């Protein structure tokens, strides 16, 4: 019995854009949530539906991990029931959300002195998203190209600094429980 792949979920060398947001599933492993809670690197650790201290002794069916790069002013939009450019057009959370939102500053890693335009967000769409929807589009909007680049830079303020964010959306089906907390010797 082993520990979960949370090492490469959080310490990956390249996170995807917010519009093409990455998603992976952990399936059978024992997950140590309390080490992530007691880390000194996370700026925000919000949880909805489940308490993060009780989370180490709750068993689920399977756990997802949605990782992408967002601006500093826009981490507030990753919450159940908010609206904005990314909460509508890029990543939508359900109202009855049962997961946790983890984020941290990454100005020393993701920004570039000449400008880093390798992260994209959807500026235009005809309608907002259903919860946990993903799209990739290229067609011209009824006037524009919907994808636009951020332009991160270390000189820029905290609202314009790149923030890497990971969303752990737990599930509970009628399948047997696999992802349990570490039982204590």
């Amino acid at each position: 019995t082993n520990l979960c792949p949370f090492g490469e979920v959080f310490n990956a060398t390249r996170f995807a854009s917010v519009y093409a947001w990455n998603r992976k599933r952990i399936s059978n492993c024992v997950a140590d949530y309390s080490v992530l809670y007691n880390s000194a690197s996370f700026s925000t650790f919000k949880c909805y539906g489940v308490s993060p201290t009780k989370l180490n002794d709750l068993c689920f069916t399977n756990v997802y991990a949605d990782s992408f790069v967002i601006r500093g002013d826009e981490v507030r939009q990753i919450a159940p029931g908010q609206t904005g450019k990314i909460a509508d057009y890029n990543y939508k959370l359900p109202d009855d959300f049962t997961g946790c939102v983890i984020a941290w500053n990454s100005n020393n890693l993701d920004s570039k002195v000449g400008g880093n335009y390798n992260y994209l967000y959807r500026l235009f769409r005809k309608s907002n998203l259903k919860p946990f929807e993903r799209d990739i589009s290229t067609e011209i909007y009824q006037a524009y190209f919907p994808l636009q680049s951020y332009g991160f830079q270390p000189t820029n303020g905290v609202g314009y600094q790149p923030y890497r964010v990971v969303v752990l959306s737990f599930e509970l089906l009628h399948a047997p429980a696999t992802v349990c907390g570490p039982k204590k010797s």
Partner: antibody, heavy 128, light 107 residues
Framework: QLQLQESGPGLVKPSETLSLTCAVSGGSISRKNWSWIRQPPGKGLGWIGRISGSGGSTDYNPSLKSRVTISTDTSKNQFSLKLSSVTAADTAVYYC?????????????????????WGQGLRVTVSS | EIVMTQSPATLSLSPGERATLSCRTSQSVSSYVAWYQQKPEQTPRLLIYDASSRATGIPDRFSGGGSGTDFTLTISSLEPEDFAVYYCQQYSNWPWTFGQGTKVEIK
């Protein structure tokens, strides 16, 4: 509960060094961010610099960075402020503060620079 | 440097009335503004963080709002305690700058 109290000399002669020490009590200095805040008499608040609780991530005000060194001493659970070549215009009330942090039952959140907990204020006078 | 200018220098006002204050920045700080209250010769107290959120143990009549370069602090009903000096802060860029201060003066 968390409490901050300053310690230092009330009278500092010019062209010498200045030392202050904020004794954090009721809470651990680690995993937080701490700052030194001045206030001249009859003037608004000013900012000296900040330090991280763990790792020593340290930043200064650009107008005073050639004269200030800020250090963290987690063995005694306290942090200190040092200045050099103080003039007569440096007379101020010095506060030590914690950069805000709100822990709820449903997780926590680190503020990017608001100061929730403050010290009592130690009045430093400079005269020859 | 992001200078922080508060437009009412002295707020002549009566108790129990509406109060309004202003904070205008040189450039955009993106809603990273805190509000403080300072009794004379006493410790400043944080009221608002992130320009729209009340601090822990703050009365409900304190409210802040705004974004960009316009930030306002509104007190719905005064007390005989809340005639003091109010300060406005930014922390978007690294020289963190406070305001010059605005005074609530009793009519």
């Amino acid at each position: 509960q968390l409490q901050l109290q300053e310690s230092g000399p009330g009278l500092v002669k010019p062209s010498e060094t200045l030392s202050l020490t904020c004794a954090v009590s009721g809470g651990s200095i680690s995993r937080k961010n701490w700052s030194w805040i001045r206030q001249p008499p009859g003037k608004g608040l000013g900012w000296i610099g900040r330090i991280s609780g763990s790792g020593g991530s340290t930043d200064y005000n650009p107008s005073l960075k050639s004269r200030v060194t800020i250090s963290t001493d987690t063995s005694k659970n306290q942090f200190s402020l040092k200045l050099s070549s103080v003039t007569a215009a440096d007379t101020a009330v010095y506060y030590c503060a914690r950069v805000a942090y709100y822990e709820d039952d449903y997780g926590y959140y680190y503020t990017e620079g608001a100061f929730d907990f403050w010290g009592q204020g130690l009045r430093v006078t400079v005269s020859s | 440097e992001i200078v922080m200018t508060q437009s009412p220098a002295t707020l002549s006002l009566s108790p129990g009335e509406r109060a309004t204050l202003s904070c205008r920045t040189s450039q955009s700080v993106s809603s990273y503004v805190a509000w403080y209250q300072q009794k004379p010769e006493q410790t400043p107290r944080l009221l608002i963080y992130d320009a729209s959120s009340r601090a822990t143990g703050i009365p409900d009549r304190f409210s802040g709002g705004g974004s960009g370069t316009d930030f306002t602090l509104t007190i719905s009903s005064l007390e005989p305690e809340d005639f003091a000096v109010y300060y406005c802060q930014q922390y978007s860029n690294w020289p963190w700058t406070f305001g010059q201060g605005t005074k609530v003066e009793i009519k």
